Amino acid sequence: MDKQIGFIGCGNMGMAMIGGMINKNIVSSNQIICSDLNTANLKNASEKYGLTTTTDNNEVAKNADILILSIKPDLYASIIKEIIKNDAIIVTIAAGKSIESTENAFNKKVKVVRVMPNTPALVGEGMSALCPNEMVTEKDLEDVLNIFNSFGQTEIVSEKLMDVVTSVSGSSPAYVYMIIEAMADAAVLDGMPRNQAYKFAAQAVLGSAKMVLETGI
Amino acid sequence: MDKQIGFIGCGNMGMAMIGGMINKNIVSSNQIICSDLNTANLKNASEKYGLTTTTDNNEVAKNADILILSIKPDLYASIIKEIIKNDAIIVTIAAGKSIESTENAFNKKVKVVRVMPNTPALVGEGMSALCPNEMVTEKDLEDVLNIFNSFGQTEIVSEKLMDVVTSVSGSSPAYVYMIIEAMADAAVLDGMPRNQAYKFAAQAVLGSAKMVLETGI
Numbered sequence: 137m138d139k140q141i142g143f144i145g146c147g148n149m150g151m152a153m154i155g156g157m158i159n160k161n162i163v164s165s166n167q168i169i170c171s172d173l174n175t176a177n178l179k180n181a182s183e184k185y186g187l188t189t190t191t192d193n194n195e196v197a198k199n200a201d202i203l204i205l206s207i208k209p210d211l212y213a214s215i216i217k218e219i220i221k222n223d224a225i226i227v228t229i230a231a232g233k234s235i236e237s238t239e240n241a242f243n244k245k246v247k248v249v250r251v252m253p254n255t256p257a258l259v260g261e262g263m264s265a266l267c268p269n270e271m272v273t274e275k276d277l278e279d280v281l282n283i284f285n286s287f288g289q290t291e292i293v294s295e296k297l298m299d300v301v302t303s304v305s306g307s308s309p310a311y312v313y314m315i316i317e318a319m320a321d322a323a324v325l326d327g328m329p330r331n332q333a334y335k336f337a338a339q340a341v342l343g344s345a346k347m348v349l350e351t352g353i
Numbered sequence: 354m355d356k357q358i359g360f361i362g363c364g365n366m367g368m369a370m371i372g373g374m375i376n377k378n379i380v381s382s383n384q385i386i387c388s389d390l391n392t393a394n395l396k397n398a399s400e401k402y403g404l405t406t407t408t409d410n411n412e413v414a415k416n417a418d419i420l421i422l423s424i425k426p427d428l429y430a431s432i433i434k435e436i437i438k439n440d441a442i443i444v445t446i447a448a449g450k451s452i453e454s455t456e457n458a459f460n461k462k463v464k465v466v467r468v469m470p471n472t473p474a475l476v477g478e479g480m481s482a483l484c485p486n487e488m489v490t491e492k493d494l495e496d497v498l499n500i501f502n503s504f505g506q507t508e509i510v511s512e513k514l515m516d517v518v519t520s521v522s523g524s525s526p527a528y529v530y531m532i533i534e535a536m537a538d539a540a541v542l543d544g545m546p547r548n549q550a551y552k553f554a555a556q557a558v559l560g561s562a563k564m565v566l567e568t569g570i
Contacts, residue, residue, distance in 0.1 A: 254557065254560060255560070255564065256557075256559075256560025256561060256563055256564050257560075258564070258568075259560070259563045259564055259566075259567045259568070260563070261556070261559055261560040261563040261564075262556075262560060263552075263553055263556040263557050263560060265553075288556070288560070289552065289556045291549060291552060291553065293545075293549070296544065297543075297544060297545055299543070300540050300543045300544060300545050301553065303539065303540070303543065304536055304539075304540055304553045304554060304557050305553075305557050307536060307539075307557075308536065308554075308557035308558055308560070308561050309561050309564075311532040311535070311536065311558070311561075312532065312558055312561035312562055312565070313561070313565070315528040315529065315532060316562065316565055318528070319521055319524060319525065319528065322520065322521075322524075323517050323520070323521055326514075326516070326517045326520065327513065327514060327517060328510075328514055328517050331570050332508060332510070334565065334570065335480075335506065335508060335566065336480055336482075336508065336518065336521045336522075337521060337525075337565075338562045338563075338565040338566040339478070339479075339480040339505070339506045339562070339566060340471065340473075340480050340521050340522050340524075340525035341525055341528070341529055341558065341562040342473075342478055342559050342562035342563055342566060343471060343472070343473025343474075343476070343478040343479060343480060343505070343525070344473060344525050344526050344528075344529035344530070345529055345533065345555045345556070345558040345559035345562060346473055346476045346477070346478040346555075346559055347472065347473050347475070347476055347478075347526075348529070348530070348533055348551065348554075348555040349476075349552065349555040349556060349559060350476045351475075351476070353548050353551065
């Protein structure tokens, strides 16, 4: 896409999203601008991707066709705008704040997509739940999906199920770590080196999950 | 590679390997020849990939620089050759037969790589253990790794650990199905549609496993 992408917040999750978009050739680095409250994060974004960085959240929002907000739930009210483009798509992540809440911060009729991504986005295997408001068009939604598809899978869900979404992704790590450790320990006891054992176990788990994902619904 | 690839056996696993190699541009379909005892399998290979098929296992072996054997463990002794190229790499899959055993069937000094792949190769997320004999060169091994890398991960293991390899991949499906079902059921009880619930659960598991695979050894 020829869209300008703006990130308010560029810690681990922002970096993950930018990495996906570049890896999948969805946008070029010269189409991305970011801010963060932490200077080390700006430095990391700049040095890794070569994108435009700024200390002014207004410079990010000024030209952004898609504006991604990845800040503390507690900071939302503060950051949220008269400078945003009239047709900008606002994307809120690490949902803890509803679409209603975000609409009432901008006041006006604004396009909003509330998203709940998860940690494995960091390795290109995220699961992202998206919920658009009524201002978002079919093409607008397609653009946001293309972004989240670049580092994981995506699903459209009602806002009422976002709680259920958090539950799934909050539980998975413990469940997975337990079965990987079990398989890896059994292998180590049978003579396999530990680093090799974890690789076999993790990839075995990943492959079985992919089988379920792709075959037998 | 400019190598001719030969498959004796082209059921699910052969099809998986061919699909990976084509998907990753490792070889073109015009570099692949296959046989199988089952006519429906030959038909499937031909119609899906457009490769050369034959009812003669000798025609497969005649020109193959890499010969992949994916038949019944019970059929190995029968199929195994004076026609094979002098420098051909013999790849045995679904290991139940040792390198020693395969060497003694060919009689001569033959290059052999015993491989143990697993079902999720079918979806591009296999875990393959490889063990070469002393005739295989560094470049020979690299070529075989490139093939198995095209539908999964790979590891070089001693033959004594192949038993451990079978154990890991034989146990994973039950462990994974149990945690995916658990997560999916909890989501369904909380109002999420079942097909959506399985997608979230499976991708959550896949992502956590990828995190272990990539970060923290």
